Amino acid sequence: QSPQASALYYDEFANLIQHEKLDPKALEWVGHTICNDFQDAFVVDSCVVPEGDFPFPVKALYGLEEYDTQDGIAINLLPLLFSQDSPLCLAPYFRLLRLCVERQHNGNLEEIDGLLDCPIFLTDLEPGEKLESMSAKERSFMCSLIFLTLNWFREIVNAFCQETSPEMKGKVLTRLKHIVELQIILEKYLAVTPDYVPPLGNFDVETLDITLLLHNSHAFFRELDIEVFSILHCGLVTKFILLGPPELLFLLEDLSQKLESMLTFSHLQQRSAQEIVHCVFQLLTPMCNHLENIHNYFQCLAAENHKVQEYHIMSSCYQRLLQIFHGLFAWSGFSQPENQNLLYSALHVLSSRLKQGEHSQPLEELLSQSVHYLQNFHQSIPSFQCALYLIRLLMVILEKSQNKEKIASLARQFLCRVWPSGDKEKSNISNDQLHALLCIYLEHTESILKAIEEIAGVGVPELINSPSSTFPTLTRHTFVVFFRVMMAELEKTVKKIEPGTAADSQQIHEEKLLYWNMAVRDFSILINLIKVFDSHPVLHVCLKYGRLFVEAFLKQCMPLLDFSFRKHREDVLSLLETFQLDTRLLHHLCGHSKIHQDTRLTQHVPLLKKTLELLVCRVKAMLT
């Protein structure tokens, strides 16, 4: 009687079948009823006009057309949903039917393989830009119809992914391209009318909880299997340079959203994290290495030659390949001792992509061969997010081990790169991604202060040449993020230096006081570059981190001024005359904060003022 209840029945019975290989006396009983009830409930003669007065051209759409068009088995959808205002159950009911016939005939679908070829009784679901501002119940009809047919097709690709016949694989791949086209059409219909949501979630948890594109991608649509990623085995055929790029984008975007949700969703959540990463180790690595190398060979020719949309899809395909590797190896179950053999098999694959024969190697040797293979992709990367995911991947694989030099060199290589300035391409160089890469680079460098002198020797010619530098991703816009990460890593390096004692040797005394001297001179050059740039957030971030620098200088330099005063008088007077210039500069910056009356800046003025009075009275105390 109730559609959600029939759906729940079908779902829960289906869960019973998938989970439990019971003695099929009941399943051989019920399946003979369920196949018949299916083939009378939805299956009609493939007559392109169904009965019903629709304001919609109803056809037998999204057929494979390699079969005979004048056929029997088609599936009635729009006359069912119109008669409601049975089809809400179609996904789970087919799931049940699929599972029972797989239990009966032992994976033999010789009765059904006509259903993968079948056209579907649908309206023309076309870009209806001509049918705009008629945001009535018909748009809910269309949005719900595309939702159901996508869910239907997702349940078909769940069904026929296990079958190894090549024609069936081709039929599945034609269905995958159909899926991504109808996904862009549905997110377009939600861009046409946003409040028009079709409420059809899965039933274990989501339906008891109540009773835009990211909600539907996981929770509202039918959840795919992991055996569906047996399709990504097929080789890439790159449509721009000469299984296609968008039909691989779909599977990789699915596996990404699966492993991110699970490791850091009904069908997936009944499997352990361990079995998921275990089966992904076989169904990613020795088959996606080929796709990664073919992609390297594609972006090598995209560099050698130099239409837009196939390169845009392949860039995102590269991003997803590296994001899968990052999510795979940043799994927190490899800290556990049982899984290191699996890590030894995984790193055996990444070492084996240059040379084989080095079996039962030491761990850091496999890391060296693996990272030597992986580093050389930095030239084939087309946007910044993929570069960010490659550097973080290399970080979290070499964290098992000296390694600082590799990360520092590669982060410098990515900051030095062109990054071709398409508007959406420079939009992939967004401020938070850059912040993450520069915190990686400035933390992993040999000397934080010398790296800050490199950036403050290249951050000042942004004004002289470009009204974009000799070190790109450095504009007047990106100056704010470079400045914030620069002074932030300056604070992280400077809070770590400990004051010794007067009993401490003269060598360690001289080296840490000259470290304080280069720290205060780096603070002077960081503060002195404010006067030429305006921009409210830049002066806010330096009035924040200026104060936290001078407080670090109060807590952790003034004890060294107390300890080494009798012996190192020339050094401490050089330190104090160096700090007095930035004290007067910070006085001027607080004055600049008062004169404009900026509300965001003038919260942090009085603490800065009283700390400058505390440091000058401390300087009077040290001189006496």
Distance CA 287, CA 224 (A): 20
Contact 77, 122 (CB under 8 A): yes
Distance CA 466, CA 349 (A): 46
Structure tokens at 316: 């995102």
Contact 146, 182 (CB under 8 A): yes
DSSP per-residue string spanning 102-154: HHHHTS--TTTTHHHH--EEEE-----TTS-S--SHHHHHHHHHHHHHHHHHH
Distance CA 429, CA 184 (A): 25
Contact 473, 419 (CB under 8 A): yes
Method: cryo-EM
Identify which of 453, 454, 367, 382 has the alpha carbon closest to the alpha carbon of residue 412.
454
Residues 231, 284, 383: CA angle, nearest 5 degrees? 100
Identify which of 170, 175, 171, 173 has the alpha carbon closest to the alpha carbon of residue 153.
175
User: Burial level of 147, CB count in 10 A (0-12/13-18/19+)?
Assistant: buried
Give the phi and the psi of residue 60 in degrees, each rounded to 5.
Answer: -105, 80
Contacting residues for 137 by C-beta, under 8 A, at least 6 apart: 85
Contact 187, 215 (CB under 8 A): no
Distance CA 220, CA 144 (A): 11
Distance CA 552, CA 572 (A): 17
Contact 219, 201 (CB under 8 A): yes
Structure tokens at 54: 């629709």
DSSP 8-class letter at 66: S
Identify which of 245, 379, 378, 376 has the alpha carbon closest to the alpha carbon of residue 312.
245
Sign of CA dihedral 571, 574, 578, 583: positive
Identify which of 218, 221, 335, 331 has the alpha carbon closest to the alpha carbon of residue 280.
331
How distant, in Å, are the alpha carbons of 1, 2, 113, 205, 265 from that of 9?
12, 10, 26, 14, 18
Distance CA 422, CA 170 (A): 35
Instruction: Give 75's strand partners.
Output: 43, 120
Contact 176, 231 (CB under 8 A): yes
Phi-psi region of 65 (alpha: psi -120 to 50; beta: other; left: phi over 0): left
Tally of CB atoms within 10 A around 465: 9
The identity of residue 25, as a single letter, is K
Contact 243, 310 (CB under 8 A): no
The identity of residue 271, as a single letter, is R
Give the phi and the psi of residue 110 in degrees, each rounded to 5.
Answer: -70, -20
Distance CA 290, CA 393 (A): 19
Contact 260, 327 (CB under 8 A): yes
Distance CA 83, CA 52 (A): 9
User: Burial level of 458, CB count in 10 A (0-12/13-18/19+)?
Assistant: middle
Contact 576, 620 (CB under 8 A): no
Residues 619, 621, 623: CA angle, nearest 5 degrees? 70
Contacts of 542-545 spanning 24+ positions with Cβ under 8 A = 542/483, 542/487, 542/589, 543/589, 543/590, 543/593, 543/601, 543/604, 543/605, 543/608, 544/604, 545/484, 545/487, 545/488, 545/490, 545/491
Tally of CB atoms within 10 A around 75: 22
Convert 280-330 into a string of H (helix), E (strand) and C (coil).
HHHHCHHHHHHHHHHHHHHHHHHHHHCCHHHHHHHHHHHHHHHHHHHHHHC
Instruction: Give 394's strand partners.
Output: none
Contact 576, 622 (CB under 8 A): yes
The identity of residue 46, as a single letter, is S
Q: What is the dihedral of CA 188, 191, 195, 197, to 10 degrees?
A: 20
- Put the strands of the sheet holding 120-123 in their side by side order: 43-44, 74-76, 120-123, 58-61
In what helix (H) or strand (E) does residue 43 lie, and over which residues does it extend? strand 43-44
What's the resolution in A? 4.2
Q: How many whole angstroms from its chain centre is CA 50?
A: 44
Instruction: Give 59's strand partners.
Output: 122
Contact 229, 117 (CB under 8 A): no
DSSP strand pairing (74-76 vs 120-123) = parallel
